[model samples]
Target: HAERLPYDASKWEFPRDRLKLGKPLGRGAFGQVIEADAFGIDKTATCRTVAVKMLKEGATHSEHRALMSELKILIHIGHHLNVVNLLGACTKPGGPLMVITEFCKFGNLSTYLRSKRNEFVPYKVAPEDLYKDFLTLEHLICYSFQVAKGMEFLASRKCIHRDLAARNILLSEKNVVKICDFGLADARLPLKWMAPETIFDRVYTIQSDVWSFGVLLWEIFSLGASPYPGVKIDEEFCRRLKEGTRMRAPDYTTPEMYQTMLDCWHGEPSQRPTFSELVEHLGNLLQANAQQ
Candidate 1:
């Protein structure tokens, strides 16, 4: 009977259990993040709640490859207080890849910012709409410190987080900050967030991460403004990048923050500061704020 049947290996199913699907927390071009119950999770590592990222089976090869690398790297990273802990992975045949991680009740920073965009936008004809005052300076500073702490941990391990942006930083309801989205992080190029001295280089390196970190800090201080202000589209960012123009963050930021961003956005990757140095600088700013 087996020989008579068309037993195609490709058609054979793999053992995988379907967990209870919950509400979608986010959506992307390749996948979405959803709430889920994790199974076979390491007891020592699991802290209870979990969020699963469901990536499309037919997504871009690069996205799939990045996700795979992220899984492997995350497993090696283990449980760290500053890092988002990966509970486990659910791999089943004929199903979307599910990556289980620690739940962030506050969602990603980008979502938080976008939610406040309209409230911050002042009506041109309105007389003195103090809408921009919603986001206080102290709130922004506290988040920035948390971000720098997470990044410092990654740097300590010689890991380069290439995509250090608001969207990748997850916050808990208790204000605990965790760095997520390691799909773009690369350990091999710890010293290289982008290629060295290569024009329009797409390479990943530590310096590149610094540049990204600066952008993230800018976004944080701006109350969730997208990477490029006065720049309408995403393509505009790329075009400006190619032309040796990085996103100019607002001047109202603290002087230390401004210098750190300047160092991160150096035209030459060699001139950038390491993550530890970033921590030192950002920590000082936080302390200064506490005093004043």
Candidate 2:
């Protein structure tokens, strides 16, 4: 028997008996997020529902590596308020790999925002059915600041979130935007939400995440609209991007917030605002919005 998992992650590992896997919340090519009940989890021994991210039965070595890398990143990232905190994992040999975290009742920010106006988009039914109660502007800034603060920590930790978007960020029952999907994209590159350097130069950095954060903000301010409108994944589009074409401000977005987004998409990576800088501005916005 060999210990293939990185580091001594025993503390994070849970016994098979403690974790009872339930119905599937989501599934992909190599990943599965199933609803599970982890008894005696963390501070409490009470039965609490959680999300278990596990690999497929016949996944490739790469998938295992992705899951392992994600686990490692999560371990390194540790705990944060706006970030998806790791609960426990099941990495026992010969058994399916599991990366457990708190379950998000509202699913992702993208879907939540979409469900606000779109009749067809299915939103998770919450106890309070009023979406307009919280409303936009101040609320959006609140979520943005939360996400920016979380991203600031990630930047400080030197973790480049290859994929940063509304879709990748989940909403807990408390409405906190918990960022997940640490392995970037699953199979194909997420070009639509990618930074210019990421697409052209293959450079992934905090600035790249910064760039994607702009799009994430766009998704937030615009209430779940896709980044680029009527744009296709073609060289012509690539040419336009290389030519310094950036997304216009969302209709509901204020000039100041849109400026922040523009700053993130600066031609040079160094010129872009750091996550800490974003945190400062967003925190300021949050403070101002509250008093108004």
Candidate 3:
């Protein structure tokens, strides 16, 4: 904790006393996301519900670094509408680190998408404004657009999100998509969602994110199906990808939209469109859809 310290932990240190940890929102072998009632987090400084991410009782050293690394990236990127914002972190001695951030209602994107399609409708009815069922084309485009907008911000901040995928997106209660998991701790890479550069050179360039965004766009249109379905990650797969073969378009996507995705997967990094270009293009598509 002393030597591996990235920041002084003062400017971003969160008060432990202010947090009233609640039940576990999620659990992993080495990590757990807990729901908490927090004070001094909201604008009013009153009680507010927030999710706290921390490691379990027995966590490895590298795992600690991964979460802290996320803190560094989240703080560096700052707050944005379409990206997950850091609320506070607890990193005091004789205690575990807690990364507090805004909570989500629907959880991850793929899970929500998978549920909605063959969805088991819950007995309890939500308020009309909060009710979301039978997703439309507009909703699909909105997810991609929101991701692009967030990536644009990250790019502006010169942050590389090496792990951008459908699974990394969190849906707010209002159904807004926010990107998460900047510092992924997985031993294996999301190779299927990565750019050629990432696969060939183990590089994580901004354009690399663009290529992954293309896969994410495919995921959205395909209703969260895993990318490169039925494909393996062997050298043969790399050869084919390098040879310019691409995944087929989802049934729901328009020709132009698929073309935009193809633009993101251009073999040459310089040929890939910028996230800003994506935002403008997707915004126009969104406008066209919402107007009808």
Q: Local distance difference test, per candidate?
A: 0.64, 0.80, 0.81
Candidate 3 Cα lDDT to native: 0.81
Ordered from best to worst TM-score, the candidate numbers read 2, 3, 1
Q: Write one digit per residue (lDDT tens) for candidate 2, span 17-83.
A: 8888899877788868888988888776588888888888887887787787778777877788888
Of 1 and 2, the candidate ahead on TM-score is 2
**What tens digits encode model 3's per-residue C-alpha lDDT throughout 89-168?**
88777678789888777778977887776532322245744545667777888888999999999999888788888888
TM-score of model 2 (CA atoms): 0.88
Better of 1 and 3 by lDDT: 3
Candidate 1 weakest ten by summed lDDT: 1-10
> Top lDDT: which candidate number?
3
Candidate 2, position 175, lDDT: 59
Q: Give TM-scores for every candidate, taking all chains together and pairing residue i with residue i.
A: 0.73, 0.88, 0.85
Clashing pairs in 3: none
Clashes of each: 7, 1, 0
Index of the highest-TM-score prediction: 2
CA lDDT for candidate 2: 0.80
Give RMSD to native, each candidate.
Answer: 9.3, 4.8, 4.7
Which pairs clash inside model 2?
A: 40-45
At residue 127, candidate 3 shows an lDDT of: 71
